[PDB]
Design a protein around this motif. Structure first.
Motif, PDB file in Angstrom:
ATOM      1  N   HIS B   2       0.833  -1.197   0.000  1.00 42.76           N
ATOM      2  CA  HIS B   2       0.000   0.000   0.000  1.00 42.76           C
ATOM      3  C   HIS B   2       0.870   1.249   0.000  1.00 42.76           C
ATOM      4  CE1 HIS B   2      -4.341  -1.001   0.461  1.00 42.76           C
ATOM      5  NE2 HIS B   2      -3.875  -2.158   0.894  1.00 42.76           N
ATOM      6  N   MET B   3       0.501   2.217  -0.840  1.00 43.15           N
ATOM      7  CA  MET B   3       1.228   3.479  -0.918  1.00 43.15           C
ATOM      8  C   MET B   3       1.062   4.255   0.382  1.00 43.15           C
ATOM      9  SD  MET B   3       1.865   3.272  -4.392  1.00 43.15           S
ATOM     10  CE  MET B   3       2.271   4.969  -4.804  1.00 43.15           C
ATOM     11  N   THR B   4       2.176   4.625   1.009  1.00 42.88           N
ATOM     12  CA  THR B   4       2.103   5.431   2.218  1.00 42.88           C
ATOM     13  C   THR B   4       1.401   6.745   1.911  1.00 42.88           C
ATOM     14  OG1 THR B   4       4.201   4.469   2.939  1.00 42.88           O
ATOM     15  CG2 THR B   4       3.411   6.432   4.098  1.00 42.88           C
ATOM     16  N   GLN B   5       0.467   7.132   2.766  1.00 39.76           N
ATOM     17  CA  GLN B   5      -0.309   8.335   2.520  1.00 39.76           C
ATOM     18  C   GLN B   5       0.087   9.464   3.463  1.00 39.76           C
ATOM     19  OE1 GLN B   5      -4.523   7.818   1.771  1.00 39.76           O
ATOM     20  NE2 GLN B   5      -3.689   7.493  -0.296  1.00 39.76           N
ATOM     21  N   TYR B 245       6.946  16.507  -0.080  1.00 35.64           N
ATOM     22  CA  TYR B 245       6.654  15.347   0.763  1.00 35.64           C
ATOM     23  C   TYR B 245       6.146  14.171  -0.062  1.00 35.64           C
ATOM     24  CZ  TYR B 245       7.510  17.540   5.246  1.00 35.64           C
ATOM     25  OH  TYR B 245       8.113  18.130   6.321  1.00 35.64           O
ATOM     26  N   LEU B 246       5.226  14.428  -0.999  1.00 41.51           N
ATOM     27  CA  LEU B 246       4.701  13.361  -1.843  1.00 41.51           C
ATOM     28  C   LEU B 246       5.821  12.626  -2.566  1.00 41.51           C
ATOM     29  CD1 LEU B 246       1.642  15.293  -3.228  1.00 41.51           C
ATOM     30  CD2 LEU B 246       1.622  13.488  -1.482  1.00 41.51           C
ATOM     31  N   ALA B 247       6.816  13.362  -3.063  1.00 45.63           N
ATOM     32  CA  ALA B 247       7.920  12.725  -3.770  1.00 45.63           C
ATOM     33  C   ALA B 247       8.760  11.837  -2.865  1.00 45.63           C
ATOM     34  CB  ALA B 247       8.811  13.790  -4.414  1.00 45.63           C
ATOM     35  N   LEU B 248       8.641  11.997  -1.550  1.00 46.96           N
ATOM     36  CA  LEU B 248       9.402  11.221  -0.584  1.00 46.96           C
ATOM     37  C   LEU B 248       8.679   9.963  -0.124  1.00 46.96           C
ATOM     38  CD1 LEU B 248      10.904  14.019   1.674  1.00 46.96           C
ATOM     39  CD2 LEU B 248      12.090  12.587  -0.012  1.00 46.96           C
ATOM     40  N   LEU B 249       7.408   9.813  -0.467  1.00 47.85           N
ATOM     41  CA  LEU B 249       6.634   8.649  -0.077  1.00 47.85           C
ATOM     42  C   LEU B 249       7.047   7.425  -0.893  1.00 47.85           C
ATOM     43  CD1 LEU B 249       3.146  10.370   0.107  1.00 47.85           C
ATOM     44  CD2 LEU B 249       4.712   9.894   2.006  1.00 47.85           C
TER      45      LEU B 249
END
Lengths: 246, 249
Positions: B2-5, B245-249
């Motif tokens: 699952h993609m970390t949100q 932040y999104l790019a770091l997930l």
């Protein structure tokens, strides 16, 4: 008599310390944030060290003094000259004695100015002592003050018009009554040899109408709205936006 | 699997607002700009002393997250009785029906959250409140320390997830050597997952330490980031920061 001078911007970084203190560590850094404001071309930094150390501390003042000094810009310290020193708070005048800022802005407690009938005589020797250190002395006044000219009698170099009620009128749409009042207040002060500063609740949404109608405003100290706008666009952009309006 | 949100905690925006005492900066407008930039949800923690976020902010951000189809995460102490200006966590969640409710032990006047639940003392008073939250439709997460020897009891209490308190990881990461902390948090995550618990994290997570955390702690489902995201946005703005932040997930 004087001649026109381009309005200068002082960034008030109180709210940056407010965010720091809420968590209680070291981020966001007050000096680093001020540095980015001076890098964007701001003419100075303003702080208001309260006696209770709610945001800016005596340690922040010294650190910002060293910063503004190394960069040849102006430091403006607001505070209550009557507050005696307590634990963790050396008092306004000894702070200015230690840092020798370009300007000291004197406030009575910010939502109102001085009662010159009541406070002028214990104000007089402190104004004189501040100037003797090399500080310009500015007095927070209400635009509706009928005894406003008495700040010259005390020996102050400038008055800072409290622009709260103008910004409240500007957001409601009809600020004409406030603008004529603040223009008239500015003109009365200048007829006494007083320079005119302003700030408090000034934003990118109301500064233009203010400078267009209030003449020869020498310096604006903007904090709250500049920090809030920087959340969207960053400090660098925000300051340059303010500068482009001066 | 699952993609970390990313859930943006907008408390520090209310910190800037309430200090003045007007309406700027607007908490709702700032959360809106975070969602426009791709944030997966909004987190708030309405404290009983109303230091920043209020119940009205909660109601307004609930309406926002609902209109944008994203998740609302309310942190709080389920034991805190209602005070002036504060209805209490469970009645707030009943009124707003957030997707997730994150429960913290935090007493009154704590600067911030600095410890998770002590399941020896609080497990039995947690049980009926966990159950009542779930009956409202809320996924229930419990703030826990990565070193808790009773971490597994959060499944017994009925919680759906735990949130590992990442404070000590961030402090070790800033000091340079965070390997020991990373293995501990990884172990804590695996312990929770072996009980069917999902794993959230947050507190003191920043753009300088999020990447290594997700790289070593497995199947982290959600990160709630506040203080450092607001502080970094002061320089770059919310949109840019959120996208970072999104790019770091």
């Amino acid at each position: 008599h004087h001649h026109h001078h381009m309005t200068q911007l002082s960034v008030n970084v109180n709210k940056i310390a407010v965010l720091r203190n809420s968590r209680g560590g070291a981020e966001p850094d007050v000096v680093r944030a001020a540095q980015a404001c001076l890098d964007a071309g701001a003419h100075g930094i303003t702080v208001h060290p309260r006696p209770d150390r709610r945001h800016i501390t005596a340690e922040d003042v010294l650190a910002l003094s060293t910063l503004t000094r190394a960069r040849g810009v102006e430091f403006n310290i607001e505070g209550n000259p009557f507050a005696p020193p307590r634990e963790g708070y050396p008092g306004l005048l000894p702070l200015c004695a230690q840092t020798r800022p370009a300007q000291a802005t004197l406030v009575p407690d910010s939502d109102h100015g001085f009662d010159f009938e009541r406070d002028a005589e214990r104000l007089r020797p402190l104004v004189a002592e501040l100037k003797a250190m090399g500080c310009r002395v500015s007095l927070f006044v209400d635009a509706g003050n009928p005894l406003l000219e008495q700040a010259a009698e005390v020996g102050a170099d400038r008055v800072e018009l409290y622009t709260g009620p103008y910004a409240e009128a500007h957001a409601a749409g009809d600020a004409a009554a406030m603008l004529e009042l603040f223009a008239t207040a500015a003109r009365r002060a200048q007829a006494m040899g007083l320079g005119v500063n302003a700030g408090h609740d000034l934003s990118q949404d109301n500064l233009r109408d203010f400078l267009a109608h209030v003449p020869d405003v020498l310096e604006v100290s903007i904090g709250h709205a500049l920090i809030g706008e920087a959340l969207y666009d960053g400090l660098d952009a925000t300051v340059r936006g303010y500068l482009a309006l001066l």
